[PDB]
Protein backbone atom coordinates (compact mmCIF):
# COMPACT_ATOMS: atom_id res chain seq x y z
CA UNK A 1 0.00 0.00 0.00
CA UNK A 2 1.13 3.57 -0.69
CA UNK A 3 0.13 4.76 2.79
CA UNK A 4 1.57 1.85 4.80
CA UNK A 5 4.94 3.07 6.09
CA UNK A 6 6.96 1.24 8.73
CA UNK A 7 10.19 1.69 10.65
CA UNK A 8 10.30 5.44 9.93
CA UNK A 9 13.60 6.86 11.17
CA UNK A 10 15.72 9.98 10.70
CA UNK A 11 19.46 9.99 10.06
CA UNK A 12 22.25 12.27 8.96
CA UNK A 13 22.78 13.03 5.28
CA UNK A 14 26.48 13.51 4.50
CA UNK A 15 26.19 13.63 0.69
CA UNK A 16 23.36 13.45 -1.79
CA UNK A 17 22.87 13.89 -5.54
CA UNK A 18 19.72 15.98 -4.91
CA UNK A 19 20.84 18.65 -2.44
CA UNK A 20 24.29 20.16 -1.90
CA UNK A 21 24.51 22.95 0.68
CA UNK A 22 26.70 25.95 -0.15
CA UNK A 23 27.24 29.47 1.20
CA UNK A 24 27.41 32.59 -0.98
CA UNK A 25 29.77 35.28 0.35
CA UNK A 26 29.28 38.75 -1.11
CA UNK A 27 29.39 42.49 -0.43
CA UNK A 28 26.08 44.37 -0.71
CA UNK A 29 26.40 48.15 -0.50
CA UNK A 30 29.76 47.71 1.19
CA UNK A 31 28.50 45.28 3.87
CA UNK A 32 30.00 41.79 3.96
CA UNK A 33 27.24 39.16 3.95
CA UNK A 34 26.81 35.41 3.64
CA UNK A 35 23.81 33.29 2.71
CA UNK A 36 23.14 29.56 3.11
CA UNK A 37 21.51 27.72 0.23
CA UNK A 38 21.49 24.39 -1.58
CA UNK A 39 22.20 23.69 -5.22
CA UNK A 40 19.27 21.82 -6.79
CA UNK A 41 17.90 20.83 -10.18
CA UNK A 42 15.30 22.77 -12.13
CA UNK A 43 11.99 21.02 -12.73
CA UNK A 44 8.91 20.85 -14.94
CA UNK A 45 5.25 20.25 -14.09
CA UNK A 46 2.32 19.55 -16.37
CA UNK A 47 -1.40 19.91 -15.87
CA UNK A 48 -3.54 17.58 -18.00
CA UNK A 49 -7.23 18.19 -18.69
CA UNK A 50 -8.93 14.99 -19.86
CA UNK A 51 -11.77 16.32 -22.02
CA UNK A 52 -13.38 12.89 -22.47
CA UNK A 53 -14.04 12.76 -18.72
CA UNK A 54 -14.03 16.51 -18.04
CA UNK A 55 -11.42 15.95 -15.33
CA UNK A 56 -8.00 17.30 -14.43
CA UNK A 57 -5.21 14.70 -14.15
CA UNK A 58 -3.12 14.81 -10.95
CA UNK A 59 -0.82 12.39 -9.09
CA UNK A 60 -0.83 11.13 -5.52
CA UNK A 61 2.23 9.60 -3.85
CA UNK A 62 4.08 9.32 -0.53
CA UNK A 63 6.50 12.21 -0.08
CA UNK A 64 9.12 11.40 2.61
CA UNK A 65 10.04 15.06 3.18
CA UNK A 66 6.37 15.97 3.63
CA UNK A 67 5.96 13.05 6.03
CA UNK A 68 8.93 14.19 8.12
CA UNK A 69 7.69 17.78 8.21
CA UNK A 70 4.27 16.61 9.42
CA UNK A 71 5.77 14.39 12.12
CA UNK A 72 7.73 17.46 13.25
CA UNK A 73 4.58 19.63 13.26
CA UNK A 74 2.66 17.22 15.47
CA UNK A 75 5.66 16.12 17.57
CA UNK A 76 8.13 19.01 17.82
CA UNK A 77 11.68 17.73 18.26
CA UNK A 78 11.21 14.72 15.95
CA UNK A 79 13.85 16.21 13.66
CA UNK A 80 16.33 17.02 16.43
CA UNK A 81 20.01 16.80 15.43
CA UNK A 82 21.06 13.22 14.67
CA UNK A 83 24.00 13.02 17.08
CA UNK A 84 24.68 9.33 16.58
CA UNK A 85 25.85 6.70 14.15
CA UNK A 86 22.89 5.51 12.11
CA UNK A 87 19.23 6.50 11.95
CA UNK A 88 17.04 7.30 14.95
CA UNK A 89 13.61 5.73 14.99
CA UNK A 90 10.71 8.18 15.27
CA UNK A 91 8.88 7.83 18.61
CA UNK A 92 6.02 8.19 17.73
CA UNK A 93 5.69 7.80 13.95
CA UNK A 94 2.65 9.07 12.11
CA UNK A 95 0.59 6.99 9.69
CA UNK A 96 2.09 7.03 6.22
CA UNK A 97 -1.03 8.88 5.06
CA UNK A 98 0.60 11.94 6.66
CA UNK A 99 3.10 12.04 3.77
CA UNK A 100 0.68 11.43 0.88
CA UNK A 101 0.38 14.52 -1.32
CA UNK A 102 -1.60 15.48 -4.40
CA UNK A 103 0.59 17.08 -7.03
CA UNK A 104 0.79 17.95 -10.66
CA UNK A 105 2.65 15.49 -12.81
CA UNK A 106 6.28 16.62 -12.43
CA UNK A 107 9.93 15.74 -12.84
CA UNK A 108 13.47 17.02 -12.45
CA UNK A 109 15.34 18.58 -15.35
CA UNK A 110 18.03 15.87 -15.06
CA UNK A 111 17.68 14.21 -18.50
CA UNK A 112 20.64 15.06 -20.78
CA UNK A 113 19.45 16.26 -24.19
CA UNK A 114 15.70 16.28 -23.48
CA UNK A 115 13.87 19.57 -23.81
CA UNK A 116 11.67 20.83 -20.96
CA UNK A 117 8.61 19.80 -22.97
CA UNK A 118 10.02 16.32 -23.55
CA UNK A 119 10.71 15.88 -19.83
CA UNK A 120 7.06 16.86 -19.25
CA UNK A 121 5.95 14.26 -21.83
CA UNK A 122 8.16 11.61 -20.22
CA UNK A 123 6.66 12.21 -16.78
CA UNK A 124 3.07 12.22 -18.10
CA UNK A 125 3.78 8.84 -19.72
CA UNK A 126 5.64 7.27 -16.81
CA UNK A 127 3.47 8.66 -14.01
CA UNK A 128 0.02 8.88 -15.64
CA UNK A 129 0.02 6.67 -18.72
CA UNK A 130 -0.79 9.54 -21.11
CA UNK A 131 0.99 9.72 -24.48
CA UNK A 132 1.72 13.36 -25.38
CA UNK A 133 3.66 15.15 -28.10
CA UNK A 134 5.79 18.16 -27.08
CA UNK A 135 3.80 20.44 -29.40
CA UNK A 136 0.63 19.41 -27.54
CA UNK A 137 1.98 21.39 -24.55
CA UNK A 138 1.31 25.04 -23.73
CA UNK A 139 3.79 26.84 -21.48
CA UNK A 140 1.74 28.27 -18.58
CA UNK A 141 4.43 29.93 -16.46
CA UNK A 142 8.09 29.84 -15.51
CA UNK A 143 9.20 30.95 -12.06
CA UNK A 144 11.64 30.47 -9.18
CA UNK A 145 10.70 27.78 -6.66
CA UNK A 146 12.05 28.41 -3.16
CA UNK A 147 13.97 31.70 -3.58
CA UNK A 148 15.12 31.65 0.03
CA UNK A 149 16.99 28.36 -0.11
CA UNK A 150 17.66 27.45 -3.74
CA UNK A 151 17.98 28.98 -7.14
CA UNK A 152 15.98 26.49 -9.20
CA UNK A 153 13.47 27.26 -11.94
CA UNK A 154 10.22 25.42 -12.53
CA UNK A 155 8.25 25.51 -15.76
CA UNK A 156 4.60 24.51 -15.81
CA UNK A 157 2.89 23.22 -18.95
CA UNK A 158 -0.73 22.49 -19.85
CA UNK A 159 -2.30 20.11 -22.32
CA UNK A 160 -5.73 18.72 -23.10
CA UNK A 161 -5.92 14.93 -23.49
CA UNK A 162 -8.56 12.34 -24.40
CA UNK A 163 -9.26 8.89 -23.00
CA UNK A 164 -7.59 7.33 -26.07
CA UNK A 165 -4.28 8.92 -25.01
CA UNK A 166 -4.24 7.05 -21.67
CA UNK A 167 -2.56 4.04 -23.26
CA UNK A 168 -0.06 3.21 -20.52
CA UNK A 169 -0.26 1.82 -16.99
CA UNK A 170 1.22 4.92 -15.35
CA UNK A 171 2.17 4.56 -11.69
CA UNK A 172 5.85 5.46 -12.05
CA UNK A 173 8.82 3.21 -12.62
CA UNK A 174 8.18 -0.06 -10.74
CA UNK A 175 11.82 -1.16 -10.71
CA UNK A 176 12.86 2.17 -9.17
CA UNK A 177 10.51 1.73 -6.20
CA UNK A 178 7.95 4.34 -7.22
CA UNK A 179 4.27 3.96 -6.33
CA UNK A 180 2.19 6.75 -7.85
CA UNK A 181 -1.61 6.85 -8.12
CA UNK A 182 -3.26 8.72 -10.99
CA UNK A 183 -6.01 11.05 -9.77
CA UNK A 184 -8.79 12.20 -12.10
CA UNK A 185 -10.40 15.28 -10.53
CA UNK A 186 -13.89 16.04 -11.95
CA UNK A 187 -14.12 19.68 -12.97
CA UNK A 188 -17.26 20.22 -10.90
CA UNK A 189 -15.37 19.36 -7.71
CA UNK A 190 -12.05 20.96 -8.66
CA UNK A 191 -12.19 24.31 -6.85
CA UNK A 192 -13.57 22.75 -3.65
CA UNK A 193 -10.81 20.15 -3.83
CA UNK A 194 -8.16 22.87 -4.12
CA UNK A 195 -9.63 25.04 -1.33
CA UNK A 196 -9.95 22.11 1.11
CA UNK A 197 -7.00 22.25 3.57
CA UNK A 198 -7.48 18.60 4.60
CA UNK A 199 -5.87 17.42 1.32
CA UNK A 200 -2.09 18.10 1.31
CA UNK A 201 -1.25 19.63 -2.04
CA UNK A 202 1.23 21.94 -3.73
CA UNK A 203 0.81 25.49 -4.89
CA UNK A 204 1.11 24.07 -8.43
CA UNK A 205 -2.16 22.19 -7.96
CA UNK A 206 -3.98 25.17 -6.45
CA UNK A 207 -2.69 27.49 -9.15
CA UNK A 208 -3.33 24.93 -11.89
CA UNK A 209 -6.95 24.62 -10.82
CA UNK A 210 -7.44 28.37 -10.48
CA UNK A 211 -5.70 29.09 -13.80
CA UNK A 212 -7.57 26.40 -15.69
CA UNK A 213 -10.99 27.45 -14.40
CA UNK A 214 -10.48 31.12 -15.23
CA UNK A 215 -8.32 30.96 -18.38
CA UNK A 216 -9.26 27.73 -20.22
CA UNK A 217 -12.61 26.32 -19.09
CA UNK A 218 -14.65 29.40 -20.24
CA UNK A 219 -13.29 28.93 -23.79
CA UNK A 220 -14.75 25.40 -23.87
CA UNK A 221 -18.23 26.06 -22.40
CA UNK B 1 20.48 46.42 -3.30
CA UNK B 2 21.59 45.38 -6.82
CA UNK B 3 25.22 46.40 -6.22
CA UNK B 4 26.77 43.01 -5.47
CA UNK B 5 30.57 42.76 -5.29
CA UNK B 6 33.13 40.00 -4.83
CA UNK B 7 30.67 37.10 -4.93
CA UNK B 8 32.25 33.81 -3.86
CA UNK B 9 31.18 30.22 -3.09
CA UNK B 10 32.16 28.62 0.22
CA UNK B 11 31.20 25.56 2.22
CA UNK B 12 28.15 25.33 4.51
CA UNK B 13 28.71 22.90 7.39
CA UNK B 14 25.94 24.13 9.73
CA UNK B 15 23.04 26.47 9.13
CA UNK B 16 19.95 27.44 11.15
CA UNK B 17 17.92 27.42 7.88
CA UNK B 18 18.72 24.06 6.26
CA UNK B 19 19.72 20.80 7.94
CA UNK B 20 20.23 17.82 5.62
CA UNK B 21 18.54 14.64 6.81
CA UNK B 22 17.60 11.24 5.42
CA UNK B 23 14.26 9.57 6.14
CA UNK B 24 14.62 5.78 6.39
CA UNK B 25 11.43 3.80 5.98
CA UNK B 26 9.88 0.57 4.74
CA UNK B 27 7.11 0.71 2.12
CA UNK B 28 5.62 -2.42 0.50
CA UNK B 29 8.19 -4.28 2.64
CA UNK B 30 11.08 -2.63 0.73
CA UNK B 31 13.65 -0.58 2.64
CA UNK B 32 13.86 2.97 1.26
CA UNK B 33 15.61 6.22 2.12
CA UNK B 34 15.11 9.83 1.05
CA UNK B 35 17.30 12.92 1.39
CA UNK B 36 15.72 16.18 2.41
CA UNK B 37 16.33 19.45 4.25
CA UNK B 38 14.66 20.36 7.52
CA UNK B 39 13.31 23.89 7.07
CA UNK B 40 10.88 26.35 8.63
CA UNK B 41 7.28 26.80 7.54
CA UNK B 42 6.34 30.23 6.18
CA UNK B 43 3.53 32.70 5.53
CA UNK B 44 2.95 35.09 2.62
CA UNK B 45 0.54 38.05 2.34
CA UNK B 46 -1.02 39.55 -0.77
CA UNK B 47 -2.21 43.09 -0.03
CA UNK B 48 -4.60 45.05 -2.25
CA UNK B 49 -4.37 48.78 -1.52
CA UNK B 50 -7.71 50.11 -2.74
CA UNK B 51 -6.68 53.76 -2.27
CA UNK B 52 -4.17 53.23 -5.07
CA UNK B 53 -5.90 50.23 -6.74
CA UNK B 54 -2.58 48.39 -6.58
CA UNK B 55 -1.23 45.04 -5.36
CA UNK B 56 1.60 45.37 -2.82
CA UNK B 57 4.72 43.26 -3.64
CA UNK B 58 8.38 43.27 -2.55
CA UNK B 59 11.65 43.32 -4.47
CA UNK B 60 14.99 42.20 -3.01
CA UNK B 61 18.28 40.43 -3.72
CA UNK B 62 18.05 36.65 -3.33
CA UNK B 63 21.54 35.08 -3.00
CA UNK B 64 20.40 31.55 -3.96
CA UNK B 65 18.62 32.88 -7.04
CA UNK B 66 21.80 34.78 -7.93
CA UNK B 67 23.91 31.64 -7.53
CA UNK B 68 21.46 29.73 -9.72
CA UNK B 69 21.81 32.30 -12.53
CA UNK B 70 25.60 32.26 -12.41
CA UNK B 71 25.50 28.46 -12.67
CA UNK B 72 23.18 28.74 -15.70
CA UNK B 73 25.46 31.23 -17.46
CA UNK B 74 28.69 29.46 -16.44
CA UNK B 75 28.15 25.77 -15.60
CA UNK B 76 30.53 24.49 -12.97
CA UNK B 77 30.59 27.83 -11.13
CA UNK B 78 29.13 26.03 -8.09
CA UNK B 79 31.41 22.97 -7.87
CA UNK B 80 32.43 21.77 -4.41
CA UNK B 81 34.74 24.30 -2.80
CA UNK B 82 37.81 22.10 -2.11
CA UNK B 83 39.87 24.89 -0.56
CA UNK B 84 40.84 26.56 2.66
CA UNK B 85 38.19 29.21 1.98
CA UNK B 86 35.53 30.56 -0.38
CA UNK B 87 36.29 30.57 -4.10
CA UNK B 88 35.64 33.76 -6.02
CA UNK B 89 33.14 33.61 -8.86
CA UNK B 90 35.10 34.53 -12.00
CA UNK B 91 33.25 35.34 -14.12
CA UNK B 92 30.35 36.54 -11.94
CA UNK B 93 27.16 38.41 -12.88
CA UNK B 94 25.63 41.77 -11.95
CA UNK B 95 23.55 41.77 -8.79
CA UNK B 96 20.40 42.36 -10.83
CA UNK B 97 20.58 38.64 -11.70
CA UNK B 98 19.42 37.76 -8.16
CA UNK B 99 16.74 40.45 -7.81
CA UNK B 100 13.24 39.00 -7.46
CA UNK B 101 9.67 40.15 -7.07
CA UNK B 102 7.73 38.26 -4.42
CA UNK B 103 4.82 38.48 -2.07
CA UNK B 104 5.53 39.82 1.38
CA UNK B 105 6.62 36.75 3.35
CA UNK B 106 8.41 35.43 6.40
CA UNK B 107 9.47 32.27 8.20
CA UNK B 108 7.52 30.79 11.10
CA UNK B 109 10.65 30.47 13.24
CA UNK B 110 9.81 32.48 16.41
CA UNK B 111 7.71 31.30 19.36
CA UNK B 112 4.97 33.71 20.41
CA UNK B 113 3.33 34.49 17.06
CA UNK B 114 0.51 32.76 15.24
CA UNK B 115 0.60 32.42 11.47
CA UNK B 116 -1.65 35.49 11.17
CA UNK B 117 0.64 37.48 13.46
CA UNK B 118 3.78 36.55 11.52
CA UNK B 119 2.05 37.88 8.41
CA UNK B 120 1.14 41.16 10.13
CA UNK B 121 4.69 41.48 11.42
CA UNK B 122 6.12 40.98 7.94
CA UNK B 123 3.59 43.32 6.31
CA UNK B 124 4.67 46.01 8.76
CA UNK B 125 8.44 45.53 8.60
CA UNK B 126 8.66 44.86 4.86
CA UNK B 127 5.81 46.95 3.47
CA UNK B 128 4.99 49.57 6.10
CA UNK B 129 1.35 48.47 6.41
CA UNK B 130 -0.30 48.00 9.80
CA UNK B 131 -2.63 44.97 9.70
CA UNK B 132 -4.66 43.12 12.26
CA UNK B 133 -4.89 39.29 12.36
CA UNK B 134 -8.69 39.54 11.96
CA UNK B 135 -8.15 41.58 8.74
CA UNK B 136 -6.58 38.51 7.07
CA UNK B 137 -8.30 35.97 4.82
CA UNK B 138 -6.52 32.62 4.37
CA UNK B 139 -6.31 32.01 0.61
CA UNK B 140 -4.37 28.75 0.41
CA UNK B 141 -2.24 26.36 2.44
CA UNK B 142 0.12 24.10 0.56
CA UNK B 143 3.44 22.31 0.54
CA UNK B 144 6.30 24.03 -1.27
CA UNK B 145 9.19 21.88 -2.42
CA UNK B 146 7.73 18.47 -1.61
CA UNK B 147 10.84 16.78 -3.01
CA UNK B 148 13.47 18.26 -0.71
CA UNK B 149 11.85 20.20 2.11
CA UNK B 150 8.25 19.34 2.99
CA UNK B 151 7.72 22.72 4.66
CA UNK B 152 4.26 24.30 4.64
CA UNK B 153 3.35 27.76 3.38
CA UNK B 154 0.13 29.66 4.17
CA UNK B 155 -0.98 32.52 1.92
CA UNK B 156 -3.17 35.31 3.31
CA UNK B 157 -5.00 38.09 1.49
CA UNK B 158 -6.12 41.40 2.91
CA UNK B 159 -7.48 44.74 1.75
CA UNK B 160 -5.77 47.93 2.93
CA UNK B 161 -5.86 51.67 2.33
CA UNK B 162 -3.32 54.46 2.67
CA UNK B 163 -4.66 55.00 6.22
CA UNK B 164 -2.94 51.73 7.15
CA UNK B 165 0.41 52.74 5.60
CA UNK B 166 1.80 54.15 8.84
CA UNK B 167 5.42 53.03 8.42
CA UNK B 168 8.16 53.16 5.77
CA UNK B 169 8.87 49.45 5.55
CA UNK B 170 11.91 48.30 3.60
CA UNK B 171 13.00 45.69 6.15
CA UNK B 172 15.35 45.95 9.13
CA UNK B 173 19.02 46.73 9.83
CA UNK B 174 17.26 46.15 1.73
CA UNK B 175 13.71 45.42 0.55
CA UNK B 176 11.83 47.68 -1.88
CA UNK B 177 8.05 47.90 -1.81
CA UNK B 178 6.42 47.53 -5.23
CA UNK B 179 2.91 48.82 -5.90
CA UNK B 180 1.54 47.07 -8.96
CA UNK B 181 -1.45 48.88 -10.56
CA UNK B 182 -4.33 46.51 -11.29
CA UNK B 183 -4.42 47.45 -14.97
CA UNK B 184 -0.88 46.19 -15.59
CA UNK B 185 -1.00 43.27 -13.15
CA UNK B 186 -1.59 40.40 -15.59
CA UNK B 187 1.03 41.72 -18.03
CA UNK B 188 3.48 42.03 -15.12
CA UNK B 189 2.91 38.40 -14.11
CA UNK B 190 3.30 37.16 -17.70
CA UNK B 191 6.48 39.19 -18.36
CA UNK B 192 9.16 36.45 -18.47
CA UNK B 193 11.89 39.05 -18.02
CA UNK B 194 10.65 39.82 -14.47
CA UNK B 195 12.12 37.26 -12.05
CA UNK B 196 9.19 36.28 -9.85
CA UNK B 197 7.71 33.44 -7.82
CA UNK B 198 4.73 31.16 -8.25
CA UNK B 199 3.20 32.93 -5.25
CA UNK B 200 3.20 36.18 -7.19
CA UNK B 201 1.81 34.50 -10.32
CA UNK B 202 -0.93 32.76 -8.35
CA UNK B 203 -1.67 35.90 -6.28
CA UNK B 204 -2.18 38.05 -9.38
CA UNK B 205 -4.22 35.35 -11.13
CA UNK B 206 -6.36 34.69 -8.03
CA UNK B 207 -6.93 38.40 -7.42
CA UNK B 208 -7.87 39.16 -11.03
CA UNK B 209 -10.37 36.31 -11.26
CA UNK B 210 -11.79 36.11 -7.72
CA UNK B 211 -11.71 39.74 -6.45
CA UNK B 212 -11.29 42.24 -9.29
CA UNK B 213 -14.54 41.41 -11.23
CA UNK B 214 -16.68 42.11 -8.15
CA UNK B 215 -15.04 45.41 -7.17
CA UNK B 216 -16.91 48.72 -7.50
C1 LIG C 1 -2.20 14.23 -29.32
N1 LIG C 1 -1.49 13.44 -29.92
C2 LIG C 1 -0.65 12.73 -29.02
C3 LIG C 1 0.43 11.90 -29.73
C4 LIG C 1 0.41 11.92 -31.18
N2 LIG C 1 1.78 11.45 -31.21
N3 LIG C 1 2.83 12.07 -30.58
C5 LIG C 1 3.95 11.40 -30.80
C6 LIG C 1 5.19 11.82 -30.28
C7 LIG C 1 6.19 12.25 -31.15
C8 LIG C 1 7.40 12.69 -30.65
C9 LIG C 1 7.63 12.71 -29.28
C10 LIG C 1 6.65 12.29 -28.40
O1 LIG C 1 6.84 12.31 -27.00
C11 LIG C 1 8.13 11.98 -26.48
C12 LIG C 1 8.93 10.96 -27.01
C13 LIG C 1 10.17 10.67 -26.45
C14 LIG C 1 10.63 11.38 -25.34
C15 LIG C 1 9.84 12.39 -24.79
C16 LIG C 1 8.60 12.67 -25.36
C17 LIG C 1 5.42 11.86 -28.91
C18 LIG C 1 3.62 10.30 -31.65
C19 LIG C 1 4.34 9.23 -32.25
N4 LIG C 1 5.77 9.09 -32.05
N5 LIG C 1 3.69 8.34 -32.99
C20 LIG C 1 2.38 8.44 -33.19
N6 LIG C 1 1.67 9.43 -32.66
C21 LIG C 1 2.26 10.37 -31.88
C22 LIG C 1 0.03 13.16 -31.82
C23 LIG C 1 -0.76 14.13 -30.94
C1 LIG D 1 16.45 38.64 8.41
N1 LIG D 1 17.52 38.27 8.85
C2 LIG D 1 18.57 38.50 7.90
C3 LIG D 1 18.66 37.42 6.81
C4 LIG D 1 18.67 36.08 7.34
N2 LIG D 1 18.45 34.89 6.52
N3 LIG D 1 17.24 34.45 6.06
C5 LIG D 1 17.40 33.34 5.33
C6 LIG D 1 16.34 32.66 4.73
C7 LIG D 1 16.14 31.29 4.88
C8 LIG D 1 15.04 30.67 4.27
C9 LIG D 1 14.13 31.43 3.52
C10 LIG D 1 14.32 32.80 3.41
O1 LIG D 1 13.46 33.63 2.66
C11 LIG D 1 12.11 33.27 2.63
C12 LIG D 1 11.31 33.40 3.76
C13 LIG D 1 9.96 33.07 3.67
C14 LIG D 1 9.42 32.62 2.48
C15 LIG D 1 10.22 32.51 1.36
C16 LIG D 1 11.56 32.84 1.43
C17 LIG D 1 15.42 33.40 4.01
C18 LIG D 1 18.81 33.04 5.30
C19 LIG D 1 19.65 32.02 4.72
N4 LIG D 1 19.13 30.94 3.92
N5 LIG D 1 20.97 32.07 4.93
C20 LIG D 1 21.51 33.04 5.67
N6 LIG D 1 20.77 33.99 6.22
C21 LIG D 1 19.41 34.03 6.06
C22 LIG D 1 17.51 35.87 8.17
C23 LIG D 1 17.45 36.90 9.30
C1 LIG E 1 13.70 6.94 -9.13
N1 LIG E 1 13.49 8.10 -8.85
C2 LIG E 1 12.75 8.23 -7.61
C3 LIG E 1 13.36 9.17 -6.57
C4 LIG E 1 14.81 9.14 -6.44
N2 LIG E 1 14.83 10.43 -5.72
N3 LIG E 1 14.30 11.61 -6.17
C5 LIG E 1 14.49 12.59 -5.29
C6 LIG E 1 14.04 13.90 -5.49
C7 LIG E 1 14.84 15.03 -5.37
C8 LIG E 1 14.30 16.31 -5.61
C9 LIG E 1 12.96 16.48 -5.99
C10 LIG E 1 12.17 15.35 -6.15
O1 LIG E 1 10.80 15.37 -6.52
C11 LIG E 1 10.27 16.42 -7.29
C12 LIG E 1 10.67 16.62 -8.59
C13 LIG E 1 10.09 17.64 -9.33
C14 LIG E 1 9.10 18.46 -8.79
C15 LIG E 1 8.69 18.24 -7.49
C16 LIG E 1 9.27 17.22 -6.74
C17 LIG E 1 12.71 14.09 -5.89
C18 LIG E 1 15.17 11.99 -4.17
C19 LIG E 1 15.65 12.43 -2.91
N4 LIG E 1 15.49 13.81 -2.51
N5 LIG E 1 16.26 11.58 -2.09
C20 LIG E 1 16.44 10.31 -2.42
N6 LIG E 1 16.01 9.86 -3.59
C21 LIG E 1 15.37 10.66 -4.49
C22 LIG E 1 15.53 8.80 -7.65
C23 LIG E 1 14.69 8.88 -8.93
MG1 LIG F 1 7.66 13.06 -10.25
Coordinates of N, CA, C and O and ligand atoms in Angstrom, one line a residue, chain A residues 118 121 131-134 136 165, ligand 1:
Chain A
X118 N 9.9 17.8 -23.5 CA 10.0 16.3 -23.6 C 10.1 15.7 -22.2 O 9.6 14.6 -22.0
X121 N 6.6 15.4 -21.2 CA 6.0 14.3 -21.8 C 6.4 12.9 -21.2 O 5.6 12.0 -21.1
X131 N 0.1 9.5 -23.4 CA 1.0 9.7 -24.5 C 0.8 11.1 -25.0 O -0.3 11.4 -25.5
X132 N 1.8 12.0 -24.9 CA 1.7 13.4 -25.4 C 2.8 13.6 -26.4 O 3.9 13.1 -26.3
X133 N 2.6 14.6 -27.3 CA 3.7 15.1 -28.1 C 4.1 16.5 -27.5 O 3.2 17.2 -27.0
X134 N 5.4 16.8 -27.6 CA 5.8 18.2 -27.1 C 5.0 19.3 -27.6 O 4.6 20.2 -26.8
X136 N 1.9 19.4 -28.2 CA 0.6 19.4 -27.5 C 0.7 20.4 -26.3 O -0.4 20.8 -25.9
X165 N -5.7 8.6 -25.3 CA -4.3 8.9 -25.0 C -3.8 8.3 -23.7 O -2.6 8.2 -23.5
Ligands
LIG1 C1 -2.2 14.2 -29.3 N1 -1.5 13.4 -29.9 C2 -0.6 12.7 -29.0 C3 0.4 11.9 -29.7 C4 0.4 11.9 -31.2 N2 1.8 11.4 -31.2 N3 2.8 12.1 -30.6 C5 4.0 11.4 -30.8 C6 5.2 11.8 -30.3 C7 6.2 12.3 -31.2 C8 7.4 12.7 -30.6 C9 7.6 12.7 -29.3 C10 6.6 12.3 -28.4 O1 6.8 12.3 -27.0 C11 8.1 12.0 -26.5 C12 8.9 11.0 -27.0 C13 10.2 10.7 -26.4 C14 10.6 11.4 -25.3 C15 9.8 12.4 -24.8 C16 8.6 12.7 -25.4 C17 5.4 11.9 -28.9 C18 3.6 10.3 -31.7 C19 4.3 9.2 -32.2 N4 5.8 9.1 -32.1 N5 3.7 8.3 -33.0 C20 2.4 8.4 -33.2 N6 1.7 9.4 -32.7 C21 2.3 10.4 -31.9 C22 0.0 13.2 -31.8 C23 -0.8 14.1 -30.9

